[PDB]
Write a protein that binds this ligand. Structure first.
Ligand code: ATP
Lengths: 108, 403, 81, 187, 103, 96
């Protein structure tokens, strides 16, 4: 047959469209899944991941570190306005918190 | 990078000529051709060959991958040029295959015959093992070629053959044809070639053949008759024979489904263990009657001896790049039995792996595909022995220009 | 086991409060924090053991804890493979 | 009325959420990498007619020194090696890209006594080293790392003794398993 | 002692003796694996160029073969669907007749 | 006898390296990242399933996924993700 092309490469994404479609079709989500749903889902997930990774890398460079650690993830999430709202009810292990000291508890 | 050339693979069974860069040869025609003094004439494509014609004469142009009759070889070349290639030789280089055991004398004689008779602009003579390796995609490995005349294991290292590591055995298509002949004579099967049959009728299994002989058959020599009979026997081989998975056991062979086959004369019958007992000699000649000799080496024995006669440092590469090729390798379960025996006999310290080039085109035309992809390379454009090279260095320049 | 809630000492609770931003801590805050942590662990481990028993397993895996935290609303990354 | 006119999925997603001259020619050409001036042919374009052969860069033959008659007679003299043999060895080295496993097979045993691979390699390296050790001015190659042949002979012998051992492999593996067993027991 | 552990110790000593014998025979580990291998590669080798392009074009033909037999395959294929579409074209004309019937 | 478990680490690292050539990521950060991917996948797929069930449809489509993304993602992230998904669904159906 012709050289097989993957759906992820065809669309222009990196996340596994095949595995996303497998999960969607065998899961509780629906009886059968259309070809466009998993592509869209994988694209959205890839975009969220790219955004959070950019923020984490920025935090890492700020802290003078080459490896993104959960600190750089927690700081990124709690510094970003929209990602914070997205992951408000999500805790990250070994991520820590922000140095948000109330102005009322400072030396006077 | 690509240049219009001519790739030739002249084996003892078939000759494959074509252009460099194609996945398949332009024309493949048997090598065991006849001869008729019309002077001596020769044929190609099997349609001018398998014809009942007055006074069919014997001839053997090339045996064991080496030229046996230079006149018949030149005639075959001329016919391949003017009949099927249909192009002047001076317009296309020539990359021709040769057996590793070819002699320097035959090499130089072929070079001078190609440079002074056809006036080809460039010439190259490559070994069948190197060509098979280049086709299969490996520069180091053991090429196992089981042709019509011999079964040979040839170790190639970095694109060069190690003569001291080569091993050969006479158990080949000729041995298989002899065994089929003996089986037919034992089962009382009259081997009738097609050219002797005018008409036939359908008869029950195992019953005598009801066929009529032609009334105006021409004069044909015993050699041509044996050639037709060997063609029929090779058809029977390709349609019936099968290699045993494990060492031949009569009890296990008597529990295998039979294979039905009908000869040209209409005699049709089923074969049971006799079709699996013949191909066993290729791997174990000790159980073959009429072969009272233990010095003969089976396929696995040849492989192991060829690997052992090489430097221990390269044996891992040979075991890991063992390449299987040849016409006899198309027999069912042949490569399975080979892999089993090699895994049993090879030290586990060295990884064993056989290339899966099991297709008919990949197997029988491996030596030609190799030359095609080797001549279709820009790098290879510097290894061409030019007409000027021949004129300046003479016939002996071949040994230095193409090992 | 017994009285292992006392394995959360005043220095540990004071470090947990420092990480939350508290500057000055009272005396009964430590008891209140122990009681709250115990109530939270009770529900989390009850959900985990409910996910475990149902699986006929004898070991509480990390996925059980993850699912319990998701049920309780505390989605936890870093332990989901 | 619905405009649409495009693909169903893309359409729903978008709206539901609002002078010829350049003939190829069979041109001849010469490869500058060759010294015989052999002329070949190729289907080149109409732009790079007469341009240098692009693959000509692939002509970096292996580096092998070339001793002279006087140099050989003076320094490379060896009682167990003659010119007839050393010149042939160097020719094979130059021809087959310095691979001794193949040089040994291409060796001319009909005119010279049989040789192994290690002796040939040692001879070649000793020649290369002695040719340059005559003076310190040569900068191309002065201290050629002559490989070890003594230890190589052992590495060959006590490994060929292991290669063709049929049941000894299983025996050694079993005793090694037992060895680890009781060693862990005595740890 | 355990009237058995000493027997196990004697068995281990016999094993040690047998291993000493096997070592005197052929050894257990060929130490000094390629210690002195100073073979210096050429500036570029120049033979990897051939091997590199060799791998480049070798897989190409193998790929082009599977692609070609796949391409010609799907060609003769839509050929069958086309002929089927001609019989299916007559069936669609029959369906149009039935649609006129329905109208 | 292998018990191989899948993950998104092979593509999370590809995107990472394409959006930041010089920056790497640790194993714990990769695990948290895969957890985030799984969580948002579950969220969006469940929202699309809910939309389908509300519209009385047994199949989820790109339109259901688009409305689910619009509902889930907040403000100026929703628009970005939706434009990305739309552009991908149009570059995928164009046979490129
Ligand atoms: N389809 C087939 N099945 C089994 N055997 C076959 C088949 N086709 C050919 N053979 C066997 O292949 C042999 C010849 O094949 P091959 O072309 O490899 O020989 P060759 O290499 O050209 O010449 P030589 O064997 O002299 O080198 C014949 O002996 C024939 O019996």
């Amino acid at each position: 047959r012709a050289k097989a092309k993957s759906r992820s490469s065809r669309a222009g994404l990196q996340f596994p469209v095949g595995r996303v479609h497998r999960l969607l079709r065998k899961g509780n989500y629906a009886e059968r899944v259309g070809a466009g749903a998993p592509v869209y889902l994988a694209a959205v997930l890839e975009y969220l991941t790219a955004e959070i990774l950019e923020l984490a890398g920025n935090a890492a460079r700020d802290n003078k570190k080459t490896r993104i650690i959960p600190r750089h993830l927690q700081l990124a999430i709690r510094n970003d306005e929209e990602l914070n709202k997205l992951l408000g009810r999500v805790t990250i292990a070994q991520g820590g918190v922000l140095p948000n000291i109330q102005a009322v508890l400072l030396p006077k | 990078d690509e240049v219009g050339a001519l790739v030739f693979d002249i084996g003892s069974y078939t000759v494959r000529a074509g252009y460099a860069g194609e996945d398949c040869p332009k024309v493949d025609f048997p090598t065991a051709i006849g001869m008729v003094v019309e002077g001596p004439t020769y044929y190609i494509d099997t349609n001018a060959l398998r014809v009942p014609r007055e006074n069919m004469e014997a001839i053997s142009p090339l045996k064991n991958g080496m030229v046996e009759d230079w006149d018949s070889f030149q005639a075959i070349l001329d016919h391949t040029y003017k009949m099927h290639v249909k192009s002047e030789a001076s317009l296309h280089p020539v990359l021709m295959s040769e057996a590793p055991w070819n002699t320097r004398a035959k090499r130089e004689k072929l070079t001078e015959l190609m440079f002074e008779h056809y006036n080809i602009p460039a010439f190259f003579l490559c070994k069948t093992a190197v060509l098979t390796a280049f086709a299969n995609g490996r520069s180091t490995g053991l090429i196992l070629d089981s042709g019509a005349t011999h079964t040979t294991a040839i170790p190639v290292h970095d694109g060069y053959v190690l003569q001291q590591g080569i091993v050969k055995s006479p158990l080949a298509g000729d041995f298989i044809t002899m065994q089929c002949r003996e089986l037919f004579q034992e089962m009382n099967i009259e081997l009738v070639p097609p050219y002797m049959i005018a008409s036939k009728e359908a008869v029950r299994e195992g019953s005598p053949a009801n066929w009529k002989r032609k009334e105006k058959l021409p004069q044909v020599t015993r050699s041509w008759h044996n050639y037709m009979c060997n063609c029929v026997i090779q058809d029977f081989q390709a349609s019936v024979l099968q290699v045993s998975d494990s060492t031949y056991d009569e009890q296990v062979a008597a529990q295998m489904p039979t294979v039905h086959y009908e000869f040209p004369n209409g005699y049709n019958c089923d074969f049971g263990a006799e079709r699996l007992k013949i191909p066993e000699g290729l791997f174990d000649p000790s159980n073959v009657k009429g072969l009272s000799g233990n010095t003969m080496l089976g396929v696995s024995h040849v492989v192991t001896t060829s690997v052992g006669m090489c430097d221990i440092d390269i044996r891992p590469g040979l075991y890991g790049s063992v390449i299987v090729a040849g016409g006899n390798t198309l027999i069912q379960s042949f490569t399975d039995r080979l892999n089993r025996e090699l895994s049993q006999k090879t030290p586990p310290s060295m990884r064993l792996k056989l290339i899966a080039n099991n297709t008919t085109v990949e197997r029988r035309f491996s030596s030609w595909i190799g030359g095609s992809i080797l001549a279709s390379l820009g790098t290879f454009q510097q290894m061409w022995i030019s007409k000027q090279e021949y004129e300046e260095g003479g016939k002996q320049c071949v040994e230095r220009k193409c090992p | 086991l017994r009285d292992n809630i006392q394995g959360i000492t005043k220095p540990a609770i004071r470090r947990l409060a420092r990480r939350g931003g508290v500057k000055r801590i009272s005396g009964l805050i430590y008891e209140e924090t122990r009681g709250v942590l115990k109530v939270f662990l009770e529900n989390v481990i009850r959900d985990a053991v409910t996910y475990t028993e149902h699986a006929k397993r004898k070991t509480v895996t990390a996925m059980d804890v993850v699912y319990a935290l998701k049920r309780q609303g505390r989605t936890l990354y870093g332990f989901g493979g | 009325k619905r405009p649409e006119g495009m693909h169903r999925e893309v359409y729903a997603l978008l709206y539901s959420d609002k002078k010829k001259v350049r003939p190829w020619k069979w041109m001849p050409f010469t490869n500058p990498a060759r010294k015989d001036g052999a002329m070949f042919f190729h289907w080149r374009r109409a732009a790079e007619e007469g341009k240098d052969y692009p693959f000509a860069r692939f002509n970096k033959t292996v580096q092998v020194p070339v001793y002279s008659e006087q140099e050989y007679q003076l320094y490379l003299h060896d009682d167990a090696w003659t010119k007839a043999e050393t010149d042939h060895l160097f020719d094979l080295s130059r021809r087959f890209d310095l691979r001794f496993v193949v040089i040994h097979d291409r060796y001319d045993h009909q005119q010279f006594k049989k040789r192994s691979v290690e002796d040939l390699k040692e001879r070649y390296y000793h020649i290369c080293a002695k040719l340059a050790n005559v003076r310190a001015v040569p900068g191309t190659d002065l201290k050629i790392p002559v490989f070890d042949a003594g230890h190589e002979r052992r590495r060959k012998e006590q490994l060929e003794r292991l290669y063709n051992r049929t049941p000894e492999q299983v025996a050694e593996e079993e005793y090694l398993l037992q060895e680890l067993r009781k060693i862990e027991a005595r740890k | 002692k355990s009237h058995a552990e000493i027997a196990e110790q004697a068995k281990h000593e016999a094993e040690i003796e047998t291993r000493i014998a096997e070592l005197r025979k052929e050894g257990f580990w060929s130490l000094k694996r390629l210690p002195k291998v100073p073979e210096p590669p050429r500036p570029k080798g120049h033979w990897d160029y051939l091997c590199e392009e060799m791998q480049w074009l070798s897989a190409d033909f193998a790929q082009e073969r599977r692609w070609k037999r796949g391409v010609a395959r799907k060609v003769v294929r839509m050929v069958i669907r086309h002929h089927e579409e001609q019989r299916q074209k007559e069936e669609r004309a029959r369906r149009e007749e039935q649609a006129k019937l329905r109208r | 006898k292998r018990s191989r478990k899948e993950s998104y680490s092979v593509y999370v690292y590809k995107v990472l390296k394409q959006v930041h050539p010089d920056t790497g990521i640790s194993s714990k950060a990769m695990g948290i990242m895969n957890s985030f991917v799984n969580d948002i996948f579950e969220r969006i797929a469940g929202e699309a399933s809910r939309l389908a069930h509300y519209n009385k449809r047994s199949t989820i489509t790109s339109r259901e996924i688009q409305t689910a993304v619009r509902l889930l993602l907040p403000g100026e992230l929703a628009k970005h993700a939706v434009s990305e998904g739309t552009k991908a669904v149009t570059k995928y159906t164009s046979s490129k």
